[model samples]
Every structure is written in structure tokens, then in C-alpha cells.
Target: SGGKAVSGETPVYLADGKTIKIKDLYSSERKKEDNIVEAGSGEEIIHLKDPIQIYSYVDGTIVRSRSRLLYKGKSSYLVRIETIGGRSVSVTPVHKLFVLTEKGIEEVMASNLKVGDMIAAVAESASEATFDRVKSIAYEKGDFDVYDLSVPEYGRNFIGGEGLLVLHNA
Candidate 1:
């Protein structure tokens, strides 16, 4: 097994303003895959109207994905909502989220739920949330890995603390 001893790079959160590639782990010969994902969300959120988390509007129920994500190169996840207005939207909980209980559904905190819960979609044309790249995005100094997602808007940074978790790299 002779090969060039160079370096292998698995650059995630690619920040390429093109596309985000999710590995097809559950894929096989019988279960093949086409470009459905790419075709659906092809560079949808590359530019933003706001600096805060981008929101994709849909009319169906919002469910969490089992995928994993690396926040600043560390294992972290908030979960992504699938099937938004017939398209996929990577969601972050910055809006009102309701949960169904005993009698009916009620609003609740974004951190109070687990996987496999039905979340209400915007139903409004709020649009999808995507990371483009921007902000002077200074550092705060930490021991762990760090990543700054610039929404690529008009340099408007919205650092609304908490309430936004995207599920990736599971």
C-alpha cells in the first residue's frame, strides 16, 4: 500500500457559499440516492436579510433530524427540521415553538424538548435560514474549537444569545 504521505482534510462547515455536503451513512446499493437534497436547497440561504439565524418558512409540521454537528469543531447539535414548504430548511429556534400536551399545544422554551417532537412551522414566508459568511466576528478566547457563521447579509450582526441549534454530522 504505497501512497503519498501528505495530509487528509475533512473541512466541514465548508463556508464555501456553494453547498453543504451531508454524508449518506444510511445509503446502500439497494437504497441509492440522487441529487434530491442538492436540487432542493441549492445555495438557498447563501445571502441573508438579517445577521441572526435565518428562518425558512413552511406549512407542515417541523421534526428533528438525527444528524450530528460540530460547533467550533466540537460535538454539538440542536437539530435541523426537514421538509419545509416542500423544501428542506436547516432551522434554529428563534421563533415561537409550541408543544402538544394533555389537552392541546402550548408555547414552550426551545431547550425544553427532545428529539422526535412536532414543531409548528412558520406558515409565513419567513424564508429559510442559511450561513453565507460575514461580520467582523471577533474572538472571545476559549479552549475548545471555534467557528463564526456569517449569514452574508449587509454586515448586520444579530447576536441574539441562545435558542438556535442545527443538527449536523450525525
Candidate 2:
């Protein structure tokens, strides 16, 4: 038998390059719903199975990336962060959010955020976001189900909450 090379078509630069499939880029499991990103509005994430892209803070810059999934989890209580501008976010106490202190901008737990604490605020777009002061903080004790998003690789942070605030993924 003689050896032969297999060629179906000619190579072209316009159609040839490193190709990555969206399905292959993501991971899925039948179980493990307990530990996941906890947020408030997940219906949008659930309804839109297509690529859900949003602006997120990665490293130091705000970059836009496709969000993976929104997970639902139960929490004993939720810490409601009400900003002075009337925007508020009801999230789990352990969730990490970017806040400002006397020292500098730091990631602080939702539970630790207090009145007068400064937190990042996002505009309609990622073009601009400002630091807003917290007007009030309240902890509602109950079995509240929360939802979170998975903004991976490029950034583990996303703009969420009523104020479009920046929060770190769990």
C-alpha cells in the first residue's frame, strides 16, 4: 500500500484561523447549584440563552465580556444597600462589592458596607462610572433566594444592582 495525504479543500486565509466554539468554551454540570454567583434579577439571564454580554471590571479596566450563566442560591439574609441617589441592591451579605475607604478603593463584603461608604456606580454604559455614597444599609433576615452571574476569564466582576454597581463574582 502507498501512503497518501488527505486533502478535502484548499486552505484560505479569509476562512482559516484559530476557531473556538461557544459550546466548547463553556463548562456544564448536572449538579452543584449550591455554590454560585448570587444576584437579584436572573430572569434575563435565564431567558436569554444566547451570549449575554455586559461590561465588567477586570484587573483595573472595565471590559465587555460574555456572561456564562446565572445561578440561583438560597441565603439566610440579604443586605440591602441603598445609595444616596435612591438606587439600591439587595444581595447576599457575603457578596463582594467594590467600595471606597479612607485608604483607597477596595473590595468589601456586602455585609461590611455601611452608611456613608462609597461604592462604584455605573452609567448606562461602561464609558463612565462614579463613586456614590451609601445612604442606608439594612439586613433582611429570611430565606431569600438570590441569583448571580458568571462573567469569567476577562473579568470576574460585573455591573449589577439597581445602581448598576460593580460586584465581584463569587
lDDT of 2 at 50: 51
| CA lDDT of every candidate | 0.25, 0.56
Residue-level lDDT of model 2, residues 1-170, one tens digit each, is 00100011111011122222222222232123532433354221232345456566665566766654644445667777778876666767777778877888888887788789888866644436578899998888875545555666656666555656677654
Flag regions of model 1 displaced more than 4 Å.
1-78, 83-96, 122-170
Name the Cα RMSD for model 1: 17.2
Q: How well does each candidate superpose onto the true structure, as a TM-score?
A: 0.22, 0.65
Q: Which stretches of candidate 2 lie over 4 Å from their true place?
A: 1-49, 58-61
Where does candidate 2 clash, by residue pair? 37-148, 38-147, 39-147, 39-148
> Per-residue lDDT tens digits of candidate 1, residues 1-170?
01100001111122222222222211111133421221122111111122222322222322211111111222122322333223122222322244445676554333444444443333223323432111111122222221223322232121111222222211
